[PDB]
Each structure stands twice: as C-alpha cells, then as structure tokens.
Amino acid sequence: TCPFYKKIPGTGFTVDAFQYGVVEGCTAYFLTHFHSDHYAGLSKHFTFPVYCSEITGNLLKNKLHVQEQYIHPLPLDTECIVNGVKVVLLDANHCPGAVMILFYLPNGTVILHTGDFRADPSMERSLLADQKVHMLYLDTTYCSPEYTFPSQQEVIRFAINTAFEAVTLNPHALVVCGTYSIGKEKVFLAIADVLGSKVGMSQEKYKTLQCLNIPEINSLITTDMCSSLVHLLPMMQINFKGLQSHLKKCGGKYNQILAFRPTGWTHSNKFTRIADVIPQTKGNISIYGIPYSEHSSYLEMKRFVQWLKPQKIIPTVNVGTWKSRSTMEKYFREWKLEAGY
C-alpha cells in the first residue's frame, strides 16, 4: 500500500509510486528521475500513463522497455495541462533528467515536490519566484547540520589535478572510476578531458549514457577499452581485489591504477578538508573516496526552504524512524522562527 507522502491531494496523481500495484484513484503516475528506489516496479508490462522528462522517458523505453504509447515526456520550464491540472517540471540539479514538479491544484493550493534535488540559489530565479507555495514535499536526505561537503566544482578541481599529476608522472598509469547508477558523470568526463582520452566502458553502460542528451557524447565515450586510459567499472569492483583483477586484463599496458569512488557524505567530512584527502593504497593501487554529492547539504536545504517559506513541509526521506522524524520537525521549526514565516 502506497504511503501518503507519495500522493498529491485533490488530484488523481502519484509521485515515484510504481511498486504498490494499481493504486486506487490514480490516473497519472509521475516519475521524478531514473534511480531504482524511485522507479521500483516499472517494467515492459506497465499499462498506465507515466509522466516524466524527455531524458527519463529515453531511459524507460531503452533500458526498462516500457512501451512508447504509455510514456508522456514534458518539456521543462513550460506550463502543461495533465488530466485537467496545470503542472510545470523544473530542473532538480540531481542526475540527468531529474525534475521537481509544481502542481497548481484546482482549489488554488500550489504544491512543490522536489523529487531528489541539490538546492541551489539559481532556483530562486526559476518559475518558483512568481507565486506562493503552500505545501513542499522535500528531499530531506541530509537534513542535519553534521552533513557538510564541498561544492561540486571544488571536488572536480581536486579530481582533475590528482589524475593529471599521477598520469604525467607515470604515463603507464590507468585511471578507473566507479559507477552504479546514472548521475555524477562529470567525475569521469572531466578527468578524461584533462588526459586527452575517451572514457571506456561496458556495452550496458554505453547504452545508458547514450540516452542522456549530453552534447557531443560520441566524442567523449567508447566501448573500446584498449583505446582508452580512463575506464568505468561497477562500484562493487572498486577495491584492491577487483582492481588487481582488472589490471591483469589489460595485457601489460599498465603498471599502476589510480581509482575514484564518488560517494555521498562519509564521516571523514567532519574533520578533513577536500584539499587534505588522501587515498587508501596497496602496492601499485590507490583508491580515493571523493565527496561528490547530488543531494542538498544541510545549509543549502535550509537556505532554499527559508527563501520559499512554505506553509507545510512533508519529508520524503528518512521517514521510517521516530527519531529521524522528530529531528527533522525540530529543524523545520527553527528555520521558520529564525526567518519569521
């Protein structure tokens, strides 16, 4: 049974609700982005209308085989009528194709569902500037002040400088980057660009990247591993055993690996600066964990909500424990008393 925080009141709509069977009353199923916890349940046998971005709809058709007649892609930043209700899709600053959804209810209530997002001051000049929001369905993944991490630009500067130094010292070093979902493509694209290389990968991952409308992608990626000195591997293989095994496969072309694991937050964030980050090393293998986040830090989240001034907040993450729920409710009240709404 579908939980209440996935239902939009006064509509026939649900958000990220595909694992509950046929939801009673639902006339349109929205999908905010192509991450498995959100699309869980979708397959080629799905026969209800799915509303989403163009990029999400490319992935639904090619990766999950959803039939075309049930995929309804909407352009961003554009007022659209769905089953009698005005909606707008906004860029969520998450992974490729990820959206927030503005719903203009027939009774005058306005609802924002963030999906998964990384709040940014640029959102204060989107179509959100133009009217009041009564209810906010909020990605609360990092809703606690211990969750700090650097800008995406600082993290990419660290990765590029680390990779270019290592490979210039040793032209026989291979760079490997972990992945297990879409998102975070800047990590491996920025490193391959500084090295003058395409990124090499499996046929399955190439297929996925080909759905993402990235400009000039054919110039940046390949399935020919031998021609590439940046390789992508499943995140589960980013360990000393998995990397040793991969180096064996490269036919004595390389004699060193430098590997990156883009994580979200880790408690090494509470002490160490990005500048001071060091790898784990065994022999000719070194592994860097880099804090590249596609979710809001605590401070970014607080700024967004204090700007928007919603009348009611419904969290969509960390909702399963009483302790998490009570923590989140306390911070919402602080924010509201501090700003005066």
Q: Which of residues 148-177 bind Ni ion (CB under 5 A)?
A: none
Rounded to 5°, angle at Cα 118 from 114 and 120: 100
Shortest spacing between CB 139 and Ni ion, in angstroms: 8
User: For residues 115 and 33, is the Cβ–Cβ distance under 8 A?
Assistant: yes
Q: What is the rounded CA–CA span in Å between residue 340 and residue 133?
A: 16
Phi, psi at 86, each rounded to 5°: -70, 130
Residue from 23, 56, 116, 303 touching Ni ion (CB under 5 A): that is 116
Site size toward Ni ion (CB under 5 A) is: 2
Looking at the Cβ atoms of 14 and 162, the one nearer to Ni ion is: 14
Which distant-in-sequence residues (6+ apart) come within 8 Å of 242 by Cβ?
233, 236
Which distant-in-sequence residues (6+ apart) come within 8 Å of 271 by Cβ?
none
Shortest spacing between CB 164 and Ni ion, in angstroms: 30
Question: Interacting stretch for Ni ion, rule CB under 5 A, among 80-88, 111-119, 229-237, 298-306?
Answer: 111-119
Shortest spacing between CB 296 and Ni ion, in angstroms: 12
Nearest to 115 by CA among 87, 137, 144: 137
Looking at the Cβ atoms of 168 and 266, the one nearer to Ni ion is: 266
Shortest spacing between CB 178 and Ni ion, in angstroms: 17
Shortest spacing between CB 159 and Ni ion, in angstroms: 21
Which distant-in-sequence residues (6+ apart) come within 8 Å of 77 by Cβ?
88, 89, 90, 126, 127
Question: Interacting stretch for Ni ion, rule CB under 5 A, among 30-38, 68-76, 106-114, 194-202?
Answer: 30-38
Rounded to 5°, angle at Cα 107 from 138 and 18: 45
Looking at the Cβ atoms of 98 and 230, the one nearer to Ni ion is: 98
Q: Is 139 in the site for Ni ion (CB under 5 A)?
A: no
One-letter amino acid at 106 equals: P
Question: Interacting stretch for Ni ion, rule CB under 5 A, among 27-35, 40-48, 61-69, 250-258?
Answer: 27-35
Question: Interacting stretch for Ni ion, rule CB under 5 A, among 12-20, 33-41, 136-144, 166-174?
Answer: 33-41
Shortest spacing between CB 94 and Ni ion, in angstroms: 6
One-letter amino acid at 182 equals: I
Angle between the N-to-C axes of helices 152-169 and 185-195, in degrees from 0 to 180, rounded to the nearest 10: 40
Looking at the Cβ atoms of 35 and 198, the one nearer to Ni ion is: 35
User: For residues 101 and 125, is the Cβ–Cβ distance under 8 A?
Assistant: no
C-alpha torsion sign, points 88, 92, 98, 101: negative
Shortest spacing between CB 294 and Ni ion, in angstroms: 7
Antiparallel, parallel or unpaired: β 80-82 and 110-113: unpaired
Q: Which string of x and - marks every residue 63-92 that binds Ni ion (by CB under 5 A)?
A: ------------------------------
Looking at the Cβ atoms of 116 and 300, the one nearer to Ni ion is: 116
Q: Is 35 in the site for Ni ion (CB under 5 A)?
A: yes
Looking at the Cβ atoms of 116 and 185, the one nearer to Ni ion is: 116
Q: What sections of the chain are H helices per DSSP?
A: 36-39, 54-62, 152-169, 185-195, 203-209, 240-249, 298-308, 322-339
Looking at the Cβ atoms of 14 and 228, the one nearer to Ni ion is: 14
Question: Interacting stretch for Ni ion, rule CB under 5 A, among 3-11, 52-60, 115-123, 187-195?
Answer: 115-123
Shortest spacing between CB 6 and Ni ion, in angstroms: 15
Looking at the Cβ atoms of 35 and 302, the one nearer to Ni ion is: 35
Which distant-in-sequence residues (6+ apart) come within 8 Å of 340 by Cβ?
none
Shortest spacing between CB 141 and Ni ion, in angstroms: 9
Q: Which of residues 277-336 bind Ni ion (CB under 5 A)?
A: none
List residues near Ni ion by CB under 5 A: 35, 116
